[PDB]
Write a protein that binds this ligand. Structure first.
Ligand SMILES: CCn1c(-c2cc(N3CCN(C4CC4)CC3)cnc2[C@H](C)OC)c2c3cc(ccc31)-c1csc(n1)C[C@H](NC(=O)[C@H]1[C@@H]3COC[C@@H]31)C(=O)N1CCC[C@H](N1)C(=O)OCC(C)(C)C2
Ligand SMILES: CCn1c(-c2cc(N3CCN(C4CC4)CC3)cnc2[C@H](C)OC)c2c3cc(ccc31)-c1csc(n1)C[C@H](NC(=O)[C@H]1[C@@H]3COC[C@@H]31)C(=O)N1CCC[C@H](N1)C(=O)OCC(C)(C)C2
Ligand SMILES: Nc1nc2c(ncn2[C@@H]2O[C@H](COP(=O)(O)OP(=O)(O)NP(=O)(O)O)[C@@H](O)[C@H]2O)c(=O)[nH]1
Ligand SMILES: Nc1nc2c(ncn2[C@@H]2O[C@H](COP(=O)(O)OP(=O)(O)NP(=O)(O)O)[C@@H](O)[C@H]2O)c(=O)[nH]1
Ligand SMILES: [Mg+2]
Ligand SMILES: [Mg+2]
Lengths: 163, 168, 170, 163
């Protein structure tokens, strides 16, 4: 069955709440397993302690750079980057979990969570999961974003793992 | 994509424009006084069933830079006019922000909303009726708020989006 | 007060718009790739013995959003039109940016400077004369730059200001 | 005699350089003494460790809030606030050192350093010194400002005292 992972989100160190995700390993197993392992830290590196560096109200929250903590980094469990697995799934609405990239076949660890339908990203970003519980936490995170995505507080994955 | 709207908060310093804006945006109250240079905020909301994006410009009420307020006034679709119910001067100044906006935007009819702020205070110098009677004359809604207790915040801005849409 | 000049840096993704801007503003070279959403900066400089305030808008090259460039081209006073000397397509993209700026401004006379960036790199694919001829046909200056060595960085931004002053006839 | 004080400036903890100021105790003795004593820390509190919270390129660098470290605080050696001593001196150009305030007779510890002539502040902010050495460091601080004054790196007074 599809695995489930959680993020415990904090704001300037203060607990905000837990969001959990279903990972669609049935349709994108390679991409799903990357995100799972990065959530557990089992390879010796991963999401715990990293920040949501880019939050744009009305569109999405983006994070996952645990190597440089500045929006340019991240790495997959397969190497620095890996290929686009498929584009079967679409950015249909809030809660969609999808891979950030810098063009074709450049998936690493950065990801975004949609807060609206972002249909023009279809076929460009691999969708591989969806928020299960705690979408109101993601909504709450928009309060700290801006038009160009810079955040006004430090939004961190204080803890994370598999359920 | 959702429709975007451009709101602009104005009034003398200390009335609580930022305290109101921040309560709308962040559901946080600012008890400390941090006078504004210029700040912009973005928030998605649903008003009367329609999802929209609010782009809110929070301004300073320093008289020194009235000349450049003008640019703010050009781009903004509507205006939240804040005074503080224990600050008669900020109420007298409301007339002034009004004249200027009507001028800059060249109309007599700009989406606009008068806000009596800090209605939590036991002191009061501007009676509700005064602000009611003044709002009546201009043809715009009047809402008493408290950023401290969070009273009236959402109504002010939505009422303002509702005033934009109407005029729109 | 000092005069403020509204400069806008445009061009395809990856050509070095941001590296050029960050060199101007902070005097160091961004070696990492942080593709831009939109950033604004302020810097006061002396150009021709006159102190002025540069307001720099650093833009996204993303082709998916080409129809949303209009708003900032509307407000910008002069444009730094950047390609990379090792990316032929970025040079070809220049035509589209210029045309868009003219269309949005509804003018044939818009302050602009053509910038060939990454001139520190050995694997050049766009000739200097190629770029000079095009800038000449456009009637605008052309400057080769490197955000890595800082070659031409000041010259490019200062030249654009000079073109704005000129077009304002002051 | 006009005393001289220094700030050692740091950028995200990295030393940037030293800025020295002549304090015009010959025209504004009370205001000069306050800044002098807060730079030495000799009353048990002062500028050491505080940050420059507002940097607006083309205009000024503002700091001095060592009680709250968020741009609203500050206190003088005389109490929470003291009177506008006089407006003899004016905001004539770069390097002018002057008191921030929130209205008449609200001087505390917050101050600003002009990087340009700001004559519209004349008669409203008490000018009380000027940069002696290190104007280039004040210029370098503008690298980290913005149109609304938010800073992109943390600019601090790592050390300060009297020369
Ligand atoms: C033109 C302005 N503008 C907008 C935009 C657009 C719109 N619309 C477009 C769609 N219309 C509807 C059909 C009508 C309405 C109007 C409105 N307002 C805006 C903003 C707020 O105006 C400032 C955007 C946007 C995006 C980019 C650049 C400029 C942009 C951009 C830069 S890089 C990238 N995008 C992909 C990026 N890559 C990296 O971060 C790489 C870094 C290094 O290698 C690993 C790592 C990535 O993967 N993501 C994960 C996916 C969401 C994506 N970021 C992102 O942030 O999009 C933001 C946003 C707002 C969704 C889009
Ligand atoms: C209209 C925008 N705008 C401008 C401005 C103006 C201009 N001009 C005006 C002059 N024209 C000349 C005749 C031609 C040309 C165009 C251009 N562009 C801008 C800016 C960059 O556009 C965003 C300003 C400015 C200033 C304020 C608010 C808005 C402002 C403002 C708010 S509070 C204050 N001012 C006093 C403040 N008080 C506190 O901080 C309190 C805190 C709590 O209690 C302790 C402590 C204080 O003492 N200082 C110490 C002193 C400088 C002062 N801050 C400050 O920062 O000035 C900023 C600035 C940029 C110099 C002026
Ligand atoms: N009692 C009370 N205090 C309030 C209320 N709203 C704001 N305040 C306080 O009033 C002071 C002024 O708040 P602020 O939001 O900064 O006002 P401002 O109008 O934005 N000032 P400026 O024009 O300089 O930007 C702050 O101390 C704030 O805590 C309210 O509803 N009740
Ligand atoms: N060798 C060299 N590399 C450069 C130069 N300018 C930029 N780069 C590199 O080119 C890559 C892209 O630079 P960047 O400034 O981000 O380009 P951009 O034009 O702003 N990209 P975007 O449209 O996505 O915002 C980065 O790796 C940067 O280090 C240059 O003059 N020389
Ligand atoms: Mg305010
Ligand atoms: Mg860029």
């Amino acid at each position: 069955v599809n695995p489930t992972v959680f993020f415990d989100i904090a704001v300037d160190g203060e607990p905000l709440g837990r969001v959990s995700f279903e990972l669609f390993a049935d349709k994108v197993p390679k991409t799903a397993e990357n995100f799972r392992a990065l959530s557990t830290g089992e390879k010796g590196f991963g999401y715990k302690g990293s920040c949501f560096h880019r939050i744009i109200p009305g569109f999405m929250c983006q994070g996952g750079d645990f190597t440089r903590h500045n929006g340019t980094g991240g790495k997959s469990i397969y190497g620095e980057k890996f290929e686009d697995e498929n584009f079967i799934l679409k950015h249909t609405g809030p809660g969609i979990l999808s891979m950030a990239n810098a063009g074709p076949n450049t998936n690493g660890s950065q990801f975004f969570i949609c807060t609206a339908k972002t249909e023009w990203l279809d076929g460009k970003h691999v969708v591989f999961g969806k928020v299960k519980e705690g979408m109101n936490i993601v909504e709450a995170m928009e309060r700290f974003g801006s038009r160009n995505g810079k955040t006004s507080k430090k939004i961190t994955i204080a803890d994370c793992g598999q359920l | 994509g959702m429709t975007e709207y451009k709101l602009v908060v104005v009034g003398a310093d200390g009335v609580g424009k930022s305290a109101l804006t921040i309560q709308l945006i962040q559901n946080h109250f600012v008890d400390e006084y941090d006078p504004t240079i210029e700040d912009s905020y973005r928030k998605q909301v649903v008003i009367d069933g329609e999802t929209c994006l609010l782009d809110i410009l929070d301004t300073a009420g320093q008289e020194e830079y009235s000349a450049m307020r003008d640019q703010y006034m050009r781009t903004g679709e509507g205006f939240l006019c804040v005074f503080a119910i224990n600050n008669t001067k900020s109420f007298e100044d409301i007339h002034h922000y009004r004249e200027q906006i009507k001028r800059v935007k060249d109309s007599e009819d700009v989406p606009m909303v008068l806000v009596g702020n800090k209605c939590d205070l036991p002191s009061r110098t501007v009676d509700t009726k005064q602000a009611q009677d003044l709002a009546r004359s201009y043809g715009i809604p009047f809402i008493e708020t408290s950023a401290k207790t969070r009273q009236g915040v959402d109504d002010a801005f939505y009422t303002l989006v509702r005033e934009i849409r109407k005029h729109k």
